[PDB]
């Protein structure tokens, strides 16, 4: 029970306005045949065009919302909408394109999917709120068959070309006209009451409904993300490495140790309240400070209310010492805080569009994160970049240009000239820092934080 059986029943009530007279009793096997895709043999790796909710969640990077509206059924133009915001009009003879035949429309579909997905996934999962025309339009741009590899590399094939009779992955599909072996899921099969807009609007105020196909496609994918990552959370599902995941996570740990260590040295807080992940470890194990942990899982719906995390009777006195919120997203941070907050607006291959302003950050695990809100940081200031080190000035062991920087807080810089070891460490730290910031992380600190207080730790 890993794939969706083609003999599973498909509820057809959502299809009967576009397809009147559709049988109530219907399987995926009969639906696939009705879509024009009947095959005589089982294809290994491709037993069904449709997939389970569990398989869809494992392949969230491949999700592309897709809707087809009857612009005016082989006789009328169709408006094809995608969650990328694209609307294509196909004639049978927020981007909006004018009516063109299927032979040219299909080339655009392949280019758009290939550019959106080449750095995200080995496939496409069309997320539908199926009413009929989207399923019956697939035969015009989709070909199916045995699982194949790219003609130019080892990746699985996602596109086919009728011009050359060859197959390609998303990276090598330039000029290709057919989407090959796509996957799809119909959100209507999950058991909803009422239409798409009414279910979507219960959880999201960011996506509107201009009544165009891309608006519906965006809403469909958003509702699917809400169901699978907002109200339901599975942190046991692992996702493949597609970018700088390892360097980013390594940078996060280095920056956290640096910032916390410096805050403790600079302001000598007697207690640190570490609020967040129940699996957290002391990031500065050698520090004198009374380290107290408070469990809070990463909030995937709305940011935590500080009143619920702190009040309702623990050290109790969160006002004493300093509070550390490392990716623990609250509505309004207290003035005595050290904070790392993911900015959901960031554009990257790890950060997928989410629900109600939030984003789905996928790095080893999937984390739906509530919308970035600048008002959460009103009691704090942006943490400036700095590098601090009390380690001995000793090279041990890469060419060298002398470092001159006011933010290299070391004994050698206090002494007048940055040593080679501290220059190498500073440059490595700066690279890690910039990697973390560019990934979408933002750092904030209590207003009294001043790196001038670190110089006297060298006496
Ligand atoms: O008759 C068919 C055709 C396709 C299919 O699943 C997958 F290959 F698309 C299952 N049965
Ligand atoms: O503990 C974590 C790790 C990552 C995360 O995502 C972040 F971008 F919002 C949230 N909490
Ligand atoms: Zn390839
Ligand atoms: Zn939405
Ligand atoms: Zn040095």
Curated annotation (Swiss-Prot):
Domain of life: Viruses
Sequence positions that bind Zn(2+) 16: 393, 412, 419, 422
Catalysed transformations (reactions): a 5'-end (5'-triphosphoguanosine)-ribonucleoside in mRNA + S-adenosyl-L-methionine = a 5'-end (N(7)-methyl 5'-triphosphoguanosine)-ribonucleoside in mRNA + S-adenosyl-L-homocysteine
Domain ExoN span(s) in chain numbering: 49-230
Record: residues binding Zn(2+) 15: 200, 204, 207, 222
Entry's localization field: Host cytoplasm; Host endoplasmic reticulum
Catalytic residues identified in the record: 67, 69, 134, 211, 216
Residues holding S-adenosyl-L-methionine: 274-280
N7-MTase domain span: 239-459
Binding site for Mg(2+) 2: 69, 211, 216
GpppA-binding as annotated region, ranges: 355-369
Sequence positions that bind Mg(2+) 1: 67, 134
Protein residues bound to Zn(2+) 14: 150, 153, 169, 172
Function noted in UniProt: Plays a role in viral RNA synthesis through two distinct activities. The N7-guanine methyltransferase activity plays a role in the formation of the cap structure GpppA-RNA. The proofreading exoribonuclease reduces the sensitivity of the virus to RNA mutagens during replication. This activity acts on both ssRNA and dsRNA in a 3'-5' direction.
Protein's recorded name: Guanine-N7 methyltransferase nsp14
Species of the source: Severe acute respiratory syndrome coronavirus 2 (2019-nCoV)
């Amino acid at each position: 029970p890993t794939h969706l059986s083609v003999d599973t029943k498909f509820k057809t009530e959502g299809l009967c306005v576009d397809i009147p007279g559709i049988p109530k009793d219907m399987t995926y096997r009969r639906l696939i045949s009705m879509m024009g895709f009947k095959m005589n043999y089982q294809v290994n790796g491709y037993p069904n065009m449709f997939i389970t909710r569990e398989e869809a969640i494992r392949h969230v990077r491949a999700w592309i919302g897709f809707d087809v509206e009857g612009c005016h059924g082989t006789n009328l133009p169709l408006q094809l909408g995608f969650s990328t915001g694209v609307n294509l009009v196909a004639v049978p003879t927020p981007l909006m394109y004018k009516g063109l035949p299927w032979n040219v429309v299909r080339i655009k579909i392949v280019q758009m999917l290939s550019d959106t997905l080449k750095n995200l996934s080995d496939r496409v999962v069309f997320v539908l709120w199926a009413h009929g025309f989207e399923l019956t339009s697939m035969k015009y741009f989709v070909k199916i068959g045995p699982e194949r590899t790219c003609c130019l590399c080892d990746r699985r094939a996602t596109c086919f070309s009728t011009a050359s009779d060859t197959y390609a992955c998303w990276h090598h599909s330039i000029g290709f006209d057919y989407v090959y072996n796509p996957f799809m899921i119909d959100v209507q099969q999950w058991g909803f009451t009422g239409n798409l807009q009414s279910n979507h609007d219960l959880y999201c105020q960011v996506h509107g409904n201009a009544h165009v196909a891309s608006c519906d496609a965006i809403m469909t994918r958003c509702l699917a993300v809400h169901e699978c990552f907002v109200k339901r959370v599975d942190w046991t599902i692992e996702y493949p490495i597609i970018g700088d995941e390892l360097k980013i996570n390594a940078a996060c740990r280095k920056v956290q140790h640096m910032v916390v260590k410096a805050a403790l040295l600079a302001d000598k807080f007697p207690v640190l309240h570490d609020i967040g992940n129940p699996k957290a470890i002391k990031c500065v194990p050698q520090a004198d400070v009374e380290w107290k942990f408070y469990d809070a899982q990463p909030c995937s719906d709305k940011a935590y209310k500080i009143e619920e995390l702190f009040y309702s009777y623990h050290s109790d006195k969160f006002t004493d010492g300093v509070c550390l919120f490392w990716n623990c997203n609250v509505d309004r941070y207290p003035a005595n805080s050290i904070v790392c907050r993911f900015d959901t607006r960031v554009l990257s291959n790890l950060n997928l569009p989410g629900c109600d302003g939030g984003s789905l950050y996928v790095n080893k695990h999937a984390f739906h994160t509530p919308a970035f809100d600048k008002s959460a940081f009103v009691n704090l200031k942006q943490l400036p970049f700095f590098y601090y080190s009390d380690s001995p000035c000793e090279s041990h062991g890469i060419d060298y240009v002398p470092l001159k920087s006011a933010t290299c807080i070391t004994r050698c810089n206090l002494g007048g000239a940055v040593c080679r070891h501290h220059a190498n460490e500073y440059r490595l730290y700066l690279d890690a820092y910039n990697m973390m910031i560019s990934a979408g992380f933002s750092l904030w600190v209590y207003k009294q934080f001043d790196t001038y207080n670190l110089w006297n730790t060298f006496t």
